[PDB]
Design a protein around this motif. Structure first.
Motif, PDB file in Angstrom:
ATOM      1  N   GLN A   6     -17.956  19.868  -8.462  1.00  5.83           N
ATOM      2  CA  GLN A   6     -18.490  19.302  -6.937  1.00  5.83           C
ATOM      3  C   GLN A   6     -17.644  17.978  -6.636  1.00  5.83           C
ATOM      4  O   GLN A   6     -17.195  18.031  -5.666  1.00  5.83           O
ATOM      5  CB  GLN A   6     -19.906  18.821  -7.052  1.00  5.83           C
ATOM      6  CG  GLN A   6     -20.571  18.570  -5.693  1.00  5.83           C
ATOM      7  CD  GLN A   6     -22.137  18.368  -5.841  1.00  5.83           C
ATOM      8  OE1 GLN A   6     -22.573  18.268  -6.698  1.00  5.83           O
ATOM      9  NE2 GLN A   6     -22.791  18.217  -4.489  1.00  5.83           N
ATOM     10  N   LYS A   7     -17.399  17.353  -7.485  1.00  6.91           N
ATOM     11  CA  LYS A   7     -16.431  15.926  -7.280  1.00  6.91           C
ATOM     12  C   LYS A   7     -15.081  16.388  -6.837  1.00  6.91           C
ATOM     13  O   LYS A   7     -14.380  15.443  -6.063  1.00  6.91           O
ATOM     14  CB  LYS A   7     -16.551  14.908  -8.390  1.00  6.91           C
ATOM     15  CG  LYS A   7     -17.828  14.225  -8.664  1.00  6.91           C
ATOM     16  CD  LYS A   7     -17.663  13.379  -9.742  1.00  6.91           C
ATOM     17  CE  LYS A   7     -16.970  11.989  -9.720  1.00  6.91           C
ATOM     18  NZ  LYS A   7     -17.346  11.271  -8.447  1.00  6.91           N
TER      19      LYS A   7
ATOM     20  N   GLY B 228     -16.618  16.526  -1.357  1.00  6.79           N
ATOM     21  CA  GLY B 228     -17.858  16.608  -2.368  1.00  6.79           C
ATOM     22  C   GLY B 228     -18.030  15.272  -2.924  1.00  6.79           C
ATOM     23  O   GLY B 228     -17.572  14.180  -2.551  1.00  6.79           O
ATOM     24  N   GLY B 229     -19.224  15.323  -3.549  1.00  6.91           N
ATOM     25  CA  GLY B 229     -19.730  13.897  -4.031  1.00  6.91           C
ATOM     26  C   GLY B 229     -21.362  14.023  -3.959  1.00  6.91           C
ATOM     27  O   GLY B 229     -21.813  14.678  -3.202  1.00  6.91           O
ATOM     28  N   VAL B 230     -21.785  13.089  -4.517  1.00  4.32           N
ATOM     29  CA  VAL B 230     -23.300  12.710  -4.479  1.00  4.32           C
ATOM     30  C   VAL B 230     -23.431  11.479  -3.883  1.00  4.32           C
ATOM     31  O   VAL B 230     -22.706  10.557  -3.863  1.00  4.32           O
ATOM     32  CB  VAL B 230     -24.099  12.805  -5.923  1.00  4.32           C
ATOM     33  CG1 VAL B 230     -23.758  14.170  -6.511  1.00  4.32           C
ATOM     34  CG2 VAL B 230     -23.004  11.700  -6.836  1.00  4.32           C
ATOM     35  N   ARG B 231     -24.712  11.435  -2.984  1.00  2.00           N
ATOM     36  CA  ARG B 231     -25.015  10.304  -2.333  1.00  2.00           C
ATOM     37  C   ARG B 231     -25.514   9.150  -3.134  1.00  2.00           C
ATOM     38  O   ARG B 231     -25.378   9.311  -4.375  1.00  2.00           O
ATOM     39  CB  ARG B 231     -25.971  10.690  -1.362  1.00  2.00           C
ATOM     40  CG  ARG B 231     -27.540  11.111  -1.912  1.00  2.00           C
ATOM     41  CD  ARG B 231     -28.381  11.494  -0.908  1.00  2.00           C
ATOM     42  NE  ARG B 231     -29.285  12.425  -1.402  1.00  2.00           N
ATOM     43  CZ  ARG B 231     -30.385  11.827  -2.052  1.00  2.00           C
ATOM     44  NH1 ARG B 231     -30.560  10.643  -2.245  1.00  2.00           N
ATOM     45  NH2 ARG B 231     -31.407  12.731  -2.478  1.00  2.00           N
ATOM     46  N   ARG B 232     -25.416   8.017  -2.383  1.00  5.84           N
ATOM     47  CA  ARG B 232     -25.750   6.825  -3.188  1.00  5.84           C
ATOM     48  C   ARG B 232     -27.160   6.967  -3.955  1.00  5.84           C
ATOM     49  O   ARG B 232     -28.364   7.542  -3.300  1.00  5.84           O
ATOM     50  CB  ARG B 232     -25.690   5.580  -2.416  1.00  5.84           C
ATOM     51  CG  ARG B 232     -24.555   5.068  -1.827  1.00  5.84           C
ATOM     52  CD  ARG B 232     -24.431   3.992  -0.671  1.00  5.84           C
ATOM     53  NE  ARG B 232     -25.184   4.682   0.359  1.00  5.84           N
ATOM     54  CZ  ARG B 232     -25.531   3.963   1.329  1.00  5.84           C
ATOM     55  NH1 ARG B 232     -25.374   2.346   1.456  1.00  5.84           N
ATOM     56  NH2 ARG B 232     -26.281   4.337   2.468  1.00  5.84           N
TER      57      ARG B 232
ATOM     58  N   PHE C 287     -28.180   8.824  -6.200  1.00  7.07           N
ATOM     59  CA  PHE C 287     -28.345  10.056  -6.876  1.00  7.07           C
ATOM     60  C   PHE C 287     -28.046  10.090  -8.496  1.00  7.07           C
ATOM     61  O   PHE C 287     -27.237   9.602  -8.943  1.00  7.07           O
ATOM     62  CB  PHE C 287     -27.640  11.292  -6.415  1.00  7.07           C
ATOM     63  CG  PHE C 287     -28.012  12.855  -6.445  1.00  7.07           C
ATOM     64  CD1 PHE C 287     -29.258  13.079  -5.678  1.00  7.07           C
ATOM     65  CD2 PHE C 287     -27.568  13.631  -6.968  1.00  7.07           C
ATOM     66  CE1 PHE C 287     -29.772  14.287  -5.690  1.00  7.07           C
ATOM     67  CE2 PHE C 287     -28.061  15.004  -7.166  1.00  7.07           C
ATOM     68  CZ  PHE C 287     -29.289  15.287  -6.569  1.00  7.07           C
ATOM     69  N   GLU C 288     -29.190  10.702  -9.117  1.00  9.45           N
ATOM     70  CA  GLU C 288     -28.996  10.941 -10.586  1.00  9.45           C
ATOM     71  C   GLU C 288     -28.844  12.401 -11.101  1.00  9.45           C
ATOM     72  O   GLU C 288     -29.328  12.385 -12.343  1.00  9.45           O
ATOM     73  CB  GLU C 288     -30.110  10.172 -11.195  1.00  9.45           C
ATOM     74  CG  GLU C 288     -30.121   8.644 -10.835  1.00  9.45           C
ATOM     75  CD  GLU C 288     -30.885   7.780 -11.721  1.00  9.45           C
ATOM     76  OE1 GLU C 288     -30.873   6.448 -11.790  1.00  9.45           O
ATOM     77  OE2 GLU C 288     -31.798   8.324 -12.294  1.00  9.45           O
ATOM     78  N   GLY C 289     -28.621  13.258 -10.124  1.00 15.77           N
ATOM     79  CA  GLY C 289     -28.553  14.552 -10.759  1.00 15.77           C
ATOM     80  C   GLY C 289     -30.004  15.185 -10.533  1.00 15.77           C
ATOM     81  O   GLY C 289     -30.007  16.514 -11.173  1.00 15.77           O
ATOM     82  N   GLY C 290     -30.794  14.645  -9.708  1.00 18.38           N
ATOM     83  CA  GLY C 290     -32.380  15.325  -9.812  1.00 18.38           C
ATOM     84  C   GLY C 290     -33.338  14.292 -10.360  1.00 18.38           C
ATOM     85  O   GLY C 290     -34.518  14.497  -9.855  1.00 18.38           O
TER      86      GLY C 290
END
Lengths: 72, 103
Positions: free
Chosen positions: A37-38, A43-47, A49-52
């Motif tokens: 994803q990165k 791509g990337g995760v929002r601020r 986010f811990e993977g669920g």
């Protein structure tokens, strides 16, 4: 003398250019690794986010209140 | 009429009045150099080295040139591993002409 002024040493770095040859170091994905994803464009995760897993700012309880008298 | 001597870690067989190329030496281009480490001297009669480096044999040689060797291109390439490297080398050499060979 306008063609004699120079900046102080260390003032400039020339930046990083990605995907420009092998000898340039960070080419072929320019330092973002292999698939994932990165590695995708945008791509990337929002601020927070811990993977669920429940984020830290959600596991903890909100407390206190804001006082209007403190701003004056 | 030839002699064998050790100069730059590798032995040379040189006849009288011939030019031999050998590793760089700390000698100016217009000065004579001495090689007292004569491994073997050959003539009509044969003389060997009971002890290494004969007993009194010396070789007189004059420096001629202090040039650099032909360029050698070094290429290191790893297949499929995104690794390529280039390099160049020019080895320093010294041309010296043998002027005299003692007994």
């Amino acid at each position: 003398r306008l063609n004699t002024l120079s900046p102080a040493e260390g003032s400039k770095k020339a930046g990083k250019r990605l995907g420009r040859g092998i000898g340039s170091g960070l080419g072929k994905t320019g330092g973002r690794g292999h698939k994932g994803q990165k590695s995708r464009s945008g791509g990337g995760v929002r601020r927070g986010f811990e993977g669920g897993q429940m984020p830290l700012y959600r596991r903890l309880p909100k407390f206190g209140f804001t006082s209007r008298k403190a701003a004056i | 009429m030839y002699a064998v001597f050790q100069s730059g870690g590798k032995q040379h067989r040189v006849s009288e009045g011939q030019t031999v190329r050998l590793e760089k030496l700390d000698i100016a281009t217009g000065e004579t150099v001495e090689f007292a480490e004569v491994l073997m001297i050959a003539n009509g009669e044969e003389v060997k080295i009971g002890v290494p480096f004969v007993d009194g044999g010396v070789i007189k040689a004059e420096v001629v040139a202090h040039g650099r060797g032909e360029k050698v291109k070094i290429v290191k390439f790893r297949r499929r591993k995104h690794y390529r490297k280039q390099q160049g080398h020019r080895q320093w050499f010294t041309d010296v002409k043998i002027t005299g060979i003692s007994a």
